[PDB]
Amino acid sequence: GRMLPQLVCRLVLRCS
């Protein structure tokens, strides 16, 4: 995984 399964939800946290 990593940078794929959370690339979206993180996207939120991408900007976190």
From Swiss-Prot:
Coiled coil: none annotated. It comes from the Eukaryota. It is found in: Secreted, Extracellular space, Surface film. Pulmonary surfactant consists of 90% lipid and 10% protein. There are 4 surfactant-associated proteins: 2 collagenous, carbohydrate-binding glycoproteins (SP-A and SP-D) and 2 small hydrophobic proteins (SP-B and SP-C). It is linked to Pulmonary surfactant metabolism dysfunction 1: A rare lung disorder due to impaired surfactant homeostasis. It is characterized by alveolar filling with floccular material that stains positive using the periodic acid-Schiff method and is derived from surfactant phospholipids and protein components. Excessive lipoproteins accumulation in the alveoli results in severe respiratory distress. Pulmonary surfactant-associated proteins promote alveolar stability by lowering the surface tension at the air-liquid interface in the peripheral air spaces. SP-B increases the collapse pressure of palmitic acid to nearly 70 millinewtons per meter. Homodimer; disulfide-linked. This is Pulmonary surfactant-associated protein B. It comes from Homo sapiens (Human). The gene is SFTPB.
